[PDB]
C-alpha cells in the first residue's frame, strides 16, 4: 500500500470534485435548461444543531459545521432543502482547499446511497470510477483503517437506500467504531428516526431566505423573467412560502421559463403545474404510434411500484426499455447519461417520482373503472404500520391527497383504520430512558413511551395531508375519524402554518384527541403559539405542557398562560428549571377544572405554592424534584394528606428531618390510591424511615412500585418492610438501593430475602448494602429461582468475590434469566479471571439494556478486554454500559466502543 498510490487516489478524487461534471448539474434534468454551479449558484445556506428533543440549539455554517464536525454527523431537512447538494459542497471544497476545515481529510468520498450495492469497496469502485486498478478490496479495507479519521464519507439520501443492498455501508453508519472513519449522513426529517440513534452530530438544513432565493433565481432564469416571476412571489402568499425551499424555488423558475402567469397555490400543485406544462410542451415528440395516454400510466406504476420496492433507479433489460425510451422524449423521466452496464433511468428528483406516483394513485383512486379503483385501493392496502406511512409514503399521500379531494377520503378512511406501529426504533427523545417526563411517568414501559410519540408523528402526517388536500372543512368528517383518540405535539417555538389551519377549520378533531402536547422553551410567551390558541376558540380533553427554562415572568405570561391552560378540560404540567414560578403556581393555574399531574423539576418552589400543590385534591400524580426550603407547617408534607386521590407520588431531595419524615409517614397513611412511590434522595432524615415504611406496608396496598434509595434507610425499616410485605402483594418494582444497614444489617436482609416468595409478579429487585452482604447471596438465588421473569436485578456495594461471582453464574446458567434487563454489580471484588469466567454466562442475556461493573481502580487483563468487546458485540440491545475504575487510557479503548453509552 505505497504512499504514492495513496496520494494517487487522493489526486483522483480532487480530479474529479474539481471537474466541470462534479461541478455542474441539471437539476430538472438535461432537457430543461437550468444549471446550477456548485461553485457559482450555490447561496449559503442557514443550518440548526439539534437537540434530542428536535429543539434547535444552535445556528451554524457550513464552515462552523465542518469545523464542529463530530461522527457520525446528520444532516436532515424536508425532501428539497439542498443536502445533497451540501455534500457536494463539501467535496467541491475540500478538493478547491477552500476550507480549513476539511484539510485535516486524506481522502473524501462521496456517493449517492440509493447507489450503493455489494460492498463498500464497489460502491466506491462502481460509483466513483477514479480508482486506481491495482487496489483491492481488502488493501482498500486495510487502507481506510490505517487511515482513520483521516478520511470523510459524504453519504447521501439514506431515505432512499435500502440497507440490505449494502450491509457494509450500514455498519459504516450504524457501526462507526470498527471503521473510524468520518462519516456525514443525508436524510430526510422523515426517515431521521433510521439513523437517529446512530449520529453524534444532528443539523437541520433551515429555509431559504428571500435574498438567497431571489439570489437562485435572479442566476437561472433572464432578468424580464427573474422579475416577473419575483413580482408573481411577492403577490401571493403560498408561493413565498414555498420559496423557502431551493428545490420549489428551481421547479418554478422552470415553470416561468415555460409559463408566462401560474397560480400554484400547493406544492403538490406546484409539481402539477410542472407535470402538465411538460406534456403540454413535449407530446409533440411522440410520433410512434396510435398510445400517449398508456405511456403515462406506465410511468405512474413505475413511479408506483418505485416507491413501494423501494427503487429510484429503472433498469429494464437490454432492448425492453422501449416505454422508458418514450418517457425519456416526453422529459417525464431522466436516463443516465455515464456509462452504466445496462440503461437505467430516473425521476430528476426523488419529489418528482413521488409526485408521479401520487398522480398516479388518485387516478386511479378516483377512477372510473373498478379494476383501476381496486388496484389503487390495493396500494393503499400495502400500508399497513404507521411508521411506514409516516416515513415510507409519507410523500406519497400528500401528493395523492394534493391531487384531488376523493382521493383524500380514501386515504384518511384508510388511515383512520390503521392499528399498527411498525417500528418503535428511532423514536426515542431522551437518553438511555420515571421521572424524566409526564410520558415516562405516566407510561408503565418504554415501549408506551415510544408508540406515545408515534402516534404524535402519525398525527403530524396527518395534518399535512389535511393542509395539502385544500378541502376547508368538506372532510371534516373523515377527518375527525382519522384524530380521534390520538395526540398532537406542538412546539411553541416552532409552529407550521398548517397548525393553524388545523385549528381555523378544524375545530372537532383538535377536540377529538385525547391530548395536546405543547412545548414551551424558554418563553413563556412565543406570539405565534399565543396566536395560534387565541384567533380561534378551542377546546381540549387534555392539554400537556412542558415549561423549559424559563427565569423571567411577568404579568402578560402568566395570564396568557392562564388563557392557553384553561382551554382544556385536564392539565398535566411540568416545570423544568424554571427559577421564574415563585409566587405564580396559584396564578397561573387561577383557572383550571382539572389538573391531572404536576411534576417540578430543579426549580425552586415557594410554601404558597406547595400549599397549591395541596390545595387541590384531584391531583393523581404528583412528582416534585429539589426542594431545599425549610418545611414548616401547612407546607408540602406536613399536609400531603389533602391528596387522597394520588396514584404516583415521587419525592427527589426534599429537604427533611426527623419530624418532617414523621409527618410523612403520617401523610402516606392517607393516600389509599397509591400504585407508586418513590422517595429518593432524603439526607438527615434520621430514623424516619422507621415511620415511613410502616405507613406504607401496614395496610393491604394497590402499591406497584416502590423505590426508596438515598433516603436514610435503616435496618429495622427493611426487618418492618419484610414483616408486612405480605400487605404489598402487587409490588412488581422494590428498588431499596443506596442504601447502607448499619446494625443487624444482614439479619434483616436475608429477614427481606427470605420474604421475597410473596411477589409474585415482582420484576425487579435493587438491594442495598451492609457487613457480609454476598453471604447472603445464595439464599437471594434461591428465592430468584421462583423468579425466572426478574427484569432488573442489582446488589450494589455488596463486594461479591468470585465465589459469588461464579454462584451467580452457575445460577444464571442452571436458572436462566431471559428477560434480563440490567444487572448492577458495583463495588464488587472480582478478579479479571473472575470476570473472564462470568463473559461466557454474561453473553447469554441478549435482553440486557444495562450493566454496571464498576468498581475500586482495577486494570484488566487484556485478555478480559479481548472478550470484553466480543461480548459486547454479541449483545444488540445494550443502551448504557458503566465501568468505572477500569483502566483504559491508552490501549483497549478503541475496540470497546458501541452504539451504547459507555462511562469510564
Ligand atoms: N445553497 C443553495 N443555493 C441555491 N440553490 C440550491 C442550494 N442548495 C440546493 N439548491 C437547489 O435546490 C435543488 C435541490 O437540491 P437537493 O440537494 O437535490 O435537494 P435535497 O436536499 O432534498 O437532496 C438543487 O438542484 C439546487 O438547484
Not at 444 to 458: C, G, H, P, Y
Not at 600 to 615: F, G, H, K, M, R
Amino acid at each position: 500500500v505505497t504512499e504514492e498510490d495513496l496520494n494517487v487516489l487522493a489526486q483522483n478524487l480532487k480530479d474529479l470534485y474539481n471537474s466541470p461534471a462534479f461541478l455542474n448539474f441539471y437539476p430538472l434534468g438535461e432537457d430543461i435548461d437550468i444549471i446550477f454551479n456548485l461553485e457559482k449558484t450555490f447561496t449559503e445556506p442557514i443550518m440548526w444543531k439539534k437537540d434530542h428533543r428536535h429543539h434547535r440549539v444552535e445556528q451554524l455554517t457550513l464552515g462552523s459545521l465542518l469545523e464542529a464536525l463530530k461522527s457520525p454527523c446528520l444532516i436532515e431537512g424536508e425532501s428539497g432543502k439542498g443536502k445533497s447538494t451540501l455534500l457536494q459542497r463539501i467535496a467541491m471544497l475540500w478538493a478547491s482547499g477552500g476550507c480549513r476545515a476539511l484539510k485535516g481529510f486524506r481522502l473524501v468520498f462521496f456517493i449517492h446511497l440509493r447507489s450503493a450495492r455489494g460492498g463498500l469497496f464497489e460502491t466506491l469502485y462502481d460509483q466513483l470510477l477514479n480508482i486506481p486498478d491495482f487496489i483491492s478490496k481488502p488493501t482498500f479495507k486495510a487502507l481506510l483503517l490505517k487511515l482513520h479519521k483521516e478520511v470523510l464519507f459524504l453519504l447521501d439520501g439514506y431515505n432512499e437506500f435500502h440497507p440490505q443492498n449494502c450491509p457494509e455501508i450500514e455498519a459504516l453508519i450504524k457501526e462507526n467504531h470498527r471503521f473510524k472513519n468520518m462519516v456525514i449522513v443525508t436524510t430526510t426529517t422523515e426517515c431521521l428516526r433510521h439513523i437517529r440513534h446512530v449520529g453524534a452530530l444532528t443539523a437541520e438544513v433551515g429555509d431559504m431566505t428571500e435574498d438567497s432565493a431571489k439570489d437562485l433565481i435572479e442566476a437561472v432564469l433572464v432578468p424580464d423573467q427573474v422579475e416577473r416571476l419575483w413580482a408573481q412571489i411577492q403577490e401571493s402568499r403560498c408561493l413565498r412560502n414555498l420559496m423557502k425551499t431551493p428545490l420549489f424555488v428551481v421547479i418554478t423558475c422552470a415553470i416561468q421559463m415555460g409559463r408566462q402567469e401560474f397560480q400554484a397555490h400547493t406544492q403538490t400543485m406546484l409539481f402539477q403545474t410542472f407535470y402538465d406544462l411538460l406534456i403540454q410542451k413535449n407530446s409533440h415528440r411522440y410520433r410512434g404510434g396510435a398510445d400517449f395516454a398508456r405511456s403515462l400510466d406506465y410511468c405512474g406504476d413505475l413511479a408506483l411500484e418505485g416507491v413501494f420496492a423501494h427503487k429510484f433507479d429503472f433498469e429494464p433489460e437490454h432492448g425492453s426499455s422501449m416505454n422508458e425510451d418514450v418517457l425519456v422524449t416526453i422529459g417525464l423521466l431522466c436516463k443516465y447519461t455515464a456509462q452504466r452496464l445496462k440503461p437505467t433511468y430516473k425521476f430528476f428528483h426523488k419529489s418528482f417520482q413521488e409526485y408521479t406516483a401520487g398522480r398516479r394513485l388518485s387516478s386511479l383512486l378516483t377512477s372510473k373503472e373498478p379494476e383501476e379503483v381496486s388496484k389503487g385501493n390495493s396500494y393503499l392496502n400495502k400500508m399497513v404500520s404507521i411508521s411506514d406511512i409516516t416515513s415510507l409514503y409519507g410523500n406519497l399521500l400528500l401528493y395523492t391527497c394534493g391531487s384531488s379531494t376523493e382521493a383524500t377520503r380514501a386515504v384518511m378512511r384508510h388511515l383512520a383504520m390503521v392499528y399498527q406501529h411498525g417500528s418503535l426504533q428511532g423514536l426515542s427523545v431522551t437518553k438511555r430512558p420515571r421521572q424524566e417526563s409526564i410520558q415516562s411517568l405516566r407510561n408503565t414501559t418504554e415501549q408506551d413511551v415510544l408508540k406515545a410519540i408515534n402516534v404524535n408523528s402519525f398525527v403530524e402526517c396527518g395534518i399535512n395531508l389535511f393542509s395539502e388536500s385544500m378541502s376547508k372543512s368538506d372532510l371534516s368528517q373523515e377527518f375527525e375519524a382519522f384524530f380521534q383518540g390520538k395526540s398532537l405535539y406542538i412546539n411553541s417555538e416552532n409552529i407550521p402554518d398548517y397548525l393553524f389551519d388545523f385549528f381555523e377549520y378544524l375545530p372537532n378533531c383538535a377536540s377529538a384527541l385525547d391530548f395536546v402536547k405543547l412545548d414551551f422553551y424558554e418563553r413563556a410567551t412565543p406570539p405565534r403559539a399565543v396566536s395560534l390558541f387565541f384567533n380561534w376558540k378551542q377546546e381540549f380533553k387534555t392539554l400537556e405542557v412542558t415549561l423549559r427554562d424559563i427565569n423571567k415572568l411577568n404579568k402578560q405570561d402568566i395570564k396568557y398562560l392562564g388563557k392557553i391552560f384553561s382551554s382544556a378540560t385536564n392539565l398535566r404540567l411540568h416545570i423544568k428549571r424554571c427559577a421564574a414560578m415563585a409566587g405564580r403556581l396559584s396564578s397561573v393555574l387561577r383557572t383550571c377544572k382539572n389538573m391531572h399531574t404536576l411534576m417540578v423539576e430543579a426549580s425552586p418552589l415557594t410554601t404558597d405554592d406547595e400549599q397549591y400543590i395541596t390545595s387541590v385534591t384531584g391531583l393523581q400524580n404528583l412528582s416534585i424534584h429539589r426542594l431545599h426550603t425549610q418545611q414548616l407547617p401547612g407546607g408540602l408534607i406536613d399536609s400531603l394528606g389533602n391528596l387522597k386521590n394520588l396514584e404516583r407520588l415521587i419525592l427527589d431531595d426534599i429537604r427533611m428531618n426527623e419530624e418532617d419524615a414523621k409527618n410523612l409517614a403520617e401523610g402516606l397513611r392517607s393516600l389509599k390510591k397509591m400504585r407508586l412511590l418513590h422517595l429518593t434522595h432524603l439526607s438527615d432524615i434520621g430514623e424516619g424511615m422507621d415511620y415511613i415504611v410502616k405507613s406504607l406496608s401496614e395496610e393491604s396496598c394497590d402499591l406497584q412500585e416502590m423505590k426508596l434509595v438515598a433516603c436514610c434507610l435503616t435496618a429495622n425499616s427493611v426487618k418492618v418492610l419484610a414483616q408486612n410485605l405480605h400487605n404489598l402483594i402487587k409490588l412488581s418494582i422494590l428498588d431499596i438501593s443506596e442504601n447502607y444497614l448499619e446494625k443487624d444489617g444482614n439479619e434483616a436482609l436475608q429477614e427481606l430475602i427470605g420474604r421475597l416468595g410473596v411477589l409474585g409478579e415482582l420484576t425487579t429487585l435493587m438491594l442495598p448494602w451492609c457487613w457480609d452482604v454476598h453471604t447472603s447471596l445464595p439464599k437471594l438465588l434461591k428465592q430468584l429461582e421462583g423468579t425466572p421473569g426478574l427484569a432488573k436485578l442489582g446488589l450494589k456495594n455488596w463486594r461479591l468475590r468470585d465465589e459469588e461471582i461464579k454462584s451467580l453464574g452457575e445460577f444464571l446458567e442452571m436458572n436462566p434469566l431471559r428477560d434480563l434487563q440490567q444487572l448492577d454489580l458495583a463495588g464488587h471484588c472480582v478478579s479479571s479471571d473472575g470476570w473472564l469466567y462470568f463473559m461466557n454466562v454474561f453473553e447469554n442475556l441478549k435482553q440486557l439494556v444495562f450493566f454496571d461493573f464498576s468498581t475500586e481502580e482495577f486494570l484488566p487483563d487484556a485478555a478480559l478486554v479481548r472478550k470484553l468487546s466480543q461480548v459486547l458485540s454479541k449483545l444488540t440491545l445494550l443502551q448504557e454500559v458503566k465501568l468505572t475504575g477500569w483502566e483504559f487510557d491508552d490501549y483497549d479503548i478503541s475496540a470497546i466502543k458501541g452504539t451504547f453509552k459507555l462511562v469510564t
